[PDB]
Amino acid sequence: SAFAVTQKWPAQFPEWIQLYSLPTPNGVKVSIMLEEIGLPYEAHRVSFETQDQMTPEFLSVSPNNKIPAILDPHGPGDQPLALFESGAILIYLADKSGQLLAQESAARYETIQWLMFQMGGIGPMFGQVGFFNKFAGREYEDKRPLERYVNEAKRLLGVLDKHLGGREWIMGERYTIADIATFPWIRNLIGFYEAGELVGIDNFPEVKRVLAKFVARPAVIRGLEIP
Amino acid sequence: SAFAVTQKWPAQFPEWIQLYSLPTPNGVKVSIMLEEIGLPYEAHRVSFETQDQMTPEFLSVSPNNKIPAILDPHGPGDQPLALFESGAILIYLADKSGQLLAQESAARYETIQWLMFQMGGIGPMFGQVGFFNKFAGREYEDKRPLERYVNEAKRLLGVLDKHLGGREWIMGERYTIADIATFPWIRNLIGFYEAGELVGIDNFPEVKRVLAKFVARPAVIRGLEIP
Ligand SMILES: N[C@@H](CCC(=O)N[C@@H](CS)C(=O)NCC(=O)O)C(=O)O
Ligand SMILES: N[C@@H](CCC(=O)N[C@@H](CS)C(=O)NCC(=O)O)C(=O)O
Ligand SMILES: N[C@@H](CCC(=O)N[C@@H](CS)C(=O)NCC(=O)O)C(=O)O
Ligand SMILES: N[C@@H](CCC(=O)N[C@@H](CS)C(=O)NCC(=O)O)C(=O)O
Ligand SMILES: [Cl-]
Ligand SMILES: [Cl-]
């Protein structure tokens, strides 16, 4: 470790996966993942209040200045590996543990398909609802932006609600990385963002059903508070 | 084929990959991909003007009511496979052709990492610039939303510009699915969306360099017009 990132977050456990994150919907995706697959890891809180995500040290593992990011001392070829983007980390950790993602077949690509649905739709659009309802955008007088993203959030929820009808999880019977990527965001929309009534969350009983099942998993319960 | 989608888009070539798309940044990702890897396919134009993406036939392969989507008659286990989400289709077609994505190692996960950067950042945020500069959002008097997404587009471009410094493509020497996912959007931002001056695109010479190289690839040139 002659690496820059460890100058701010030194590894007490320099053999385990290093986690640079914060209990946000995108961050808990990865901590939940690690808890679910039983891989040993060390967690470091990246504080936004002190702008830790803008430091050159953090930028060396995540040039996008965003959490989560990992640094696996024992990546492929037992060489160290840095990664950012929650979805990429999910796929990586799935491959490495052989868990929560089918090895091939139609099911693998359908799982990635729903993961992309979250990455390009759920995450970014719910994020906009948060800006316009919880943060600086709350004060904008023209409420058409808020309505645009509430309506998009409703459309996405309905797509997911229709899909979950008759299924235990997103991929039917098997719990997968798709669930791990999706439900922390639904949780955040109706909790921290206070948009539950706004998007009419009770109108999506299937989404609520699976969310309820998600947060009752002990691994999930741990991961939600980490770090 | 007792499938619903083929009731509106019947396959002249019922042995080749079926492409339901439209020359949009997300659509050309997949047509460019298919042209680059030399896989035979058939293209069907999904017209938004007639709301073809809302028909039950389209929804059976893409429940999110969005293009691109494919239907591969000969997917895994020589069973038919439907997929939506451009990024998922890119990874699928990469695996199937053994092209444009490393089989493993650090490079594979770093490629997916940059693909996720596009999926969750570039695509959704440039899309918002288009709404507020080209479409209905253009007329909103409060210009703070437009500025929010222009500024985010600038931040993303700078992340990418810093990264491309000294590299031939996103993954350095090798042209990958990351380039195929990213540059159709940069092209669209400064072409169709007319936001080139708005985001100050000349300030990102590396991005412009690689974009120039991208659109001079013949496969890319074909794919941009398809269907
Ligand atoms: N597409 C990215 C999004 C990551 C992201 O948005 N992280 C937020 C917290 S949930 C962040 O780090 N914000 C810090 C900043 O933008 O300054 C991913 O899935 O990892
Ligand atoms: N401060 C920036 C970043 C705030 C931020 O990163 N929010 C996260 C949620 S905590 C987000 O929207 N991520 C979008 C995604 O995951 O795609 C902003 O105003 O957008
Ligand atoms: N995350 C999706 C985004 C797909 C997407 O946004 N498609 C647009 C065209 S580029 C669309 O089909 N719009 C139709 C609609 O929303 O009604 C992907 O990458 O495939
Ligand atoms: N009409 C819808 C959909 C329009 C649409 O699908 N735009 C595409 C570009 S043509 C987009 O923004 N895709 C976002 C992405 O790829 O993540 C809207 O106003 O957002
Ligand atoms: Cl599915
Ligand atoms: Cl990299």
UniProtKB/TrEMBL annotation, chains A, B:
The keyword Transferase applies. It comes from the Bacteria. Glutathione 1 binds at T24, N26, Q53, K66, I67, S86. Residues 104-227 form the GST C-terminal domain. InterPro entries: Glutathione-S-Trfase_C-like, Glutathione-S-Trfase_C_sf, Glutathione_S-Trfase, Glutathione_S-Trfase_N, GST_C, Thioredoxin-like_sf. Its EC number is 2.5.1.18. Keywords: Transferase. This is Glutathione S-transferase. It comes from Pseudomonas fluorescens (strain ATCC BAA-477 / NRRL B-23932 / Pf-5).
